[PDB]
Structure formats: C-alpha cells, structure tokens
PDB file of C-alpha atoms in Angstrom:
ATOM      1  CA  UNK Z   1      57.766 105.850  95.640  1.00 52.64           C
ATOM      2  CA  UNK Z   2      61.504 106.134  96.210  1.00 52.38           C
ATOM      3  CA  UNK Z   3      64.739 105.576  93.897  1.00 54.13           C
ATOM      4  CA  UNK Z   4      62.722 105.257  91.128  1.00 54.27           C
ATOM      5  CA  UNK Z   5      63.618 108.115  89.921  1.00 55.91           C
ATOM      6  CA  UNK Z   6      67.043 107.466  88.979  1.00 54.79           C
ATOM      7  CA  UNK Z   7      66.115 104.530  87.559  1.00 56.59           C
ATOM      8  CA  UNK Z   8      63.620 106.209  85.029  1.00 57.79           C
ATOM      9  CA  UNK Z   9      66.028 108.991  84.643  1.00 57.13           C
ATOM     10  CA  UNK Z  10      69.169 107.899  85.212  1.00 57.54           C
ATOM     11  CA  UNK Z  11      68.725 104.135  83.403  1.00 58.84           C
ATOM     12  CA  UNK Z  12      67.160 105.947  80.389  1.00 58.30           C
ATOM     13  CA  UNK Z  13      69.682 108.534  79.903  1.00 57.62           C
ATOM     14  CA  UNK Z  14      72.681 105.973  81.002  1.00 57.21           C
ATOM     15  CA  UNK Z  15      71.075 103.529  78.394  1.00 56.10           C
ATOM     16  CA  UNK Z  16      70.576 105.983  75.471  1.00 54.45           C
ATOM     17  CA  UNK Z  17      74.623 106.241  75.063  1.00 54.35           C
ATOM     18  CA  UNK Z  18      74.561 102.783  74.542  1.00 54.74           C
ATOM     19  CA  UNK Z  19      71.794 102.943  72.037  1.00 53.29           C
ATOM     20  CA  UNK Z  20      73.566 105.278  70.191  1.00 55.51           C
ATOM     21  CA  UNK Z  21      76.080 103.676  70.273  1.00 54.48           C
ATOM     22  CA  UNK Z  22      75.315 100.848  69.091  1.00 54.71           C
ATOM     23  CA  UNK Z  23      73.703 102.683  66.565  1.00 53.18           C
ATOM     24  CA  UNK Z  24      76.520 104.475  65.582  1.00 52.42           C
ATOM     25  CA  UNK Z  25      78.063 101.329  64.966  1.00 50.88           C
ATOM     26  CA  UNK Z  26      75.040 100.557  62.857  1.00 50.90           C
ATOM     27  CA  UNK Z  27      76.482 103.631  60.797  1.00 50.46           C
ATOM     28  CA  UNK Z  28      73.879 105.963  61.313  1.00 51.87           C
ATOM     29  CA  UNK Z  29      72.447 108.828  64.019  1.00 53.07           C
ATOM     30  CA  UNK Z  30      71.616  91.923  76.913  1.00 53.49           C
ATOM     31  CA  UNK Z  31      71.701  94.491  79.252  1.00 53.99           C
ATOM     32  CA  UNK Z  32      70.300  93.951  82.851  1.00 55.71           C
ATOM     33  CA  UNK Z  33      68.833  95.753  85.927  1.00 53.79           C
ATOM     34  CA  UNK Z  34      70.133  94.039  89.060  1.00 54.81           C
ATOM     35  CA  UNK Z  35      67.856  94.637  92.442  1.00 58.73           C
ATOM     36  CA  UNK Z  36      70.180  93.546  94.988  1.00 60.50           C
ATOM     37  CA  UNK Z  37      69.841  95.379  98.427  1.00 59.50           C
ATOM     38  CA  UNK Z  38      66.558  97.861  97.314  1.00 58.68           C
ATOM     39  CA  UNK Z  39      68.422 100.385 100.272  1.00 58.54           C
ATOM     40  CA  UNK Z  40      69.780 103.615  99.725  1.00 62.93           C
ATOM     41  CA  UNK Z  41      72.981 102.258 101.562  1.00 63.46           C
ATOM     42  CA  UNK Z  42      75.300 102.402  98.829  1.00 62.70           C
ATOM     43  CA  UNK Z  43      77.714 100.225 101.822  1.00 62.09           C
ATOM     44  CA  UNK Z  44      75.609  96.880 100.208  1.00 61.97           C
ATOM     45  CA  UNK Z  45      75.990  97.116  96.542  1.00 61.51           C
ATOM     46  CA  UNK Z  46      79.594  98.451  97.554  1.00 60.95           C
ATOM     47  CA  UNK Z  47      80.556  94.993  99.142  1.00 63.07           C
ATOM     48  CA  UNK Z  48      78.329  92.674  96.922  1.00 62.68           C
ATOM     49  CA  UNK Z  49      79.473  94.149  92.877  1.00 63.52           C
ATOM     50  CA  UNK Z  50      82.958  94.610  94.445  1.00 61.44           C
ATOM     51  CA  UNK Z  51      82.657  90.494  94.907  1.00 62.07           C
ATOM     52  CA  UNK Z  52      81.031  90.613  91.209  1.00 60.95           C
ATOM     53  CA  UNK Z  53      83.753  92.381  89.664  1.00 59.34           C
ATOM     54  CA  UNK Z  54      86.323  90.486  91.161  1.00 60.58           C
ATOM     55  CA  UNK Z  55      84.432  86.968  90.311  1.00 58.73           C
ATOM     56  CA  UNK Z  56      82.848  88.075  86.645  1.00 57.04           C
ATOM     57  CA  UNK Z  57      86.472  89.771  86.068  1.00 54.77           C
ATOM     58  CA  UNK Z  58      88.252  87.372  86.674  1.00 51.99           C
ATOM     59  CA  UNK Z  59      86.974  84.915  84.457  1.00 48.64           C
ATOM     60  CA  UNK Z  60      87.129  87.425  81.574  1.00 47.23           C
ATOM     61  CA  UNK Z  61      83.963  88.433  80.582  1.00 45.21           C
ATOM     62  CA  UNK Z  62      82.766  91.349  78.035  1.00 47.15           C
ATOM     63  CA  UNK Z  63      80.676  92.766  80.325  1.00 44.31           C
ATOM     64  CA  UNK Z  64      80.705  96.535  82.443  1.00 42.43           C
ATOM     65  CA  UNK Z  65      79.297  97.283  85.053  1.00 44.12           C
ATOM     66  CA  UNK Z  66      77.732 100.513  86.789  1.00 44.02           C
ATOM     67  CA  UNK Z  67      76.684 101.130  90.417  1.00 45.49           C
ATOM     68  CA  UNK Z  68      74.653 104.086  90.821  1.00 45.60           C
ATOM     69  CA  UNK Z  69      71.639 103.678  92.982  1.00 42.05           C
ATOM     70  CA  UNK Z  70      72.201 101.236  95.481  1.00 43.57           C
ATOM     71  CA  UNK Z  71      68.827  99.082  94.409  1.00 45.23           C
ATOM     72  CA  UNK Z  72      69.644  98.130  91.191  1.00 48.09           C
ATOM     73  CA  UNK Z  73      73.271  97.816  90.064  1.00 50.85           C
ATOM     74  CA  UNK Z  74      73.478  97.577  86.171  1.00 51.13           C
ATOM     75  CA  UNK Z  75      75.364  95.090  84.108  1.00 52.47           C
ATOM     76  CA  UNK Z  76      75.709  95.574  80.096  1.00 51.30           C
ATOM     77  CA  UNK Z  77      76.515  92.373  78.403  1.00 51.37           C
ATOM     78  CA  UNK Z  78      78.290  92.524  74.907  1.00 51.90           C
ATOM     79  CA  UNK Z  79      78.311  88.699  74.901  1.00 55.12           C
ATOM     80  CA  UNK Z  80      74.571  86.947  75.644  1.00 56.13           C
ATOM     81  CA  UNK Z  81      76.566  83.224  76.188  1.00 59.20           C
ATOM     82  CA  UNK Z  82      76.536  83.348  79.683  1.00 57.28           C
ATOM     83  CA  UNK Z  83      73.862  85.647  80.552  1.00 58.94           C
ATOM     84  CA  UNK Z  84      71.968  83.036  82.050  1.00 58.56           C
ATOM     85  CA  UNK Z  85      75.676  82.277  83.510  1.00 64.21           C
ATOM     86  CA  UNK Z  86      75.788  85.082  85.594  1.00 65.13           C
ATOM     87  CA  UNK Z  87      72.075  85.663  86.255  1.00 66.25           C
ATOM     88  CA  UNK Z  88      72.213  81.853  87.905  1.00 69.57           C
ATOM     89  CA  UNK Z  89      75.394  83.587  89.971  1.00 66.88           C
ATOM     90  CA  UNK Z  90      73.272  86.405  91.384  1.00 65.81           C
ATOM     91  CA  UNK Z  91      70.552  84.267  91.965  1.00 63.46           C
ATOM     92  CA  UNK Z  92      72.990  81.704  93.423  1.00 61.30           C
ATOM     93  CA  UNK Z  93      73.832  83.837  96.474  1.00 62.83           C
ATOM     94  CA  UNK Z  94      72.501  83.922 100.102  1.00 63.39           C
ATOM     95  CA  UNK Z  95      69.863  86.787  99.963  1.00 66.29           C
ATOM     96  CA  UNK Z  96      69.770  86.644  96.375  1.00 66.15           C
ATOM     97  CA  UNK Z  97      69.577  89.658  93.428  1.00 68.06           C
ATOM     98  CA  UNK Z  98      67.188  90.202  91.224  1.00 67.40           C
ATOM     99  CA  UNK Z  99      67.466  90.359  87.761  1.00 66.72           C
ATOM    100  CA  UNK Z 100      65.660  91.557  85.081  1.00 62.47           C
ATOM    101  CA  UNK Z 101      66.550  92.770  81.252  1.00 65.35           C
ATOM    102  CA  UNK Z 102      66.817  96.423  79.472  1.00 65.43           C
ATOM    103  CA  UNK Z 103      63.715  97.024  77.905  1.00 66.36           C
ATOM    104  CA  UNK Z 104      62.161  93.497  76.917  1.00 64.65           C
ATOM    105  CA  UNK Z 105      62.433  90.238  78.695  1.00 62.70           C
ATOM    106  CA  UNK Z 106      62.469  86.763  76.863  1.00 67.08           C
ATOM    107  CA  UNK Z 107      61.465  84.772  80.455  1.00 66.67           C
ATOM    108  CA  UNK Z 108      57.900  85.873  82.006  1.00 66.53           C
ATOM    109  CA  UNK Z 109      55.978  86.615  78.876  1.00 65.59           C
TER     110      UNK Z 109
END
C-alpha cells in the first residue's frame, strides 16, 4: 500500500465532476488512468506529460489532461477516435506507460 489513496480518493472525486457533468449535459442532476513512473517523484511525470502535452497538443486533440500523483497521470478523452492513437503512443515509448480505462475496460475481459 502506497498512492493508492489518491487514486481511490482523488480519481473518484476528480471523476465525479465529470460525471456530473456530463450528466448535466444529459439535462438532469474514454477516460484513462496512465501508470507511467509508479514513484512519488513528481520530477518523472513532470518531464514525460510535459512531452505529452506538447506532442498530443500539438496535433489538436479534445483531450485534458491532469497530473496529480506521480503514478498515474490522467487523460479525459472527449473524442474515442484515437484513443487507441495515443494509448499505442504511451505504449510506444522507451520504458513504456501503462494504460488502463475509467471504470470499465473493453480489452482484457
């Protein structure tokens, strides 16, 4: 045990906006989890989402991103075309992130 604690937390409450949110939009009261370091040293996921941003960014893509807890940074995707897109980016790099989707996964049954 370690970290996980934001990420049951934190992810929940950060993620329960966006619910409502979206559910406000509904008119009435993909995402993804990114393990890329899995250390506390915030220095990693500094460097590595700043190359992200600047790459994802760039190319214009309806996505935001949050880095709080340097093991997972978290991507929310309004647009699911390229998900696969930028997974295959993160998984495309020299020690590699891992990623996994809010709530449900469609891969790994």
């Amino acid at each position: 045990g370690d970290i996980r604690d934001y990420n049951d937390a934190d992810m929940a409450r950060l993620l329960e906006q966006w619910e409502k949110d979206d559910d406000i939009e509904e008119g009435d009261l993909l995402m993804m989890f990114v393990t890329v370091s899995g250390n506390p040293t915030e220095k990693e996921t500094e460097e590595i989402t700043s190359l992200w941003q600047g790459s994802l960014f760039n190319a214009n893509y309806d996505v935001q991103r949050f880095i709080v807890g340097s093991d997972r940074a978290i991507f929310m995707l309004r647009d699911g075309s390229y998900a696969w897109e930028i997974k295959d980016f993160l998984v495309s790099q020299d020690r590699c992130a891992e990623v996994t989707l809010e709530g449900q996964m469609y891969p790994g049954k």
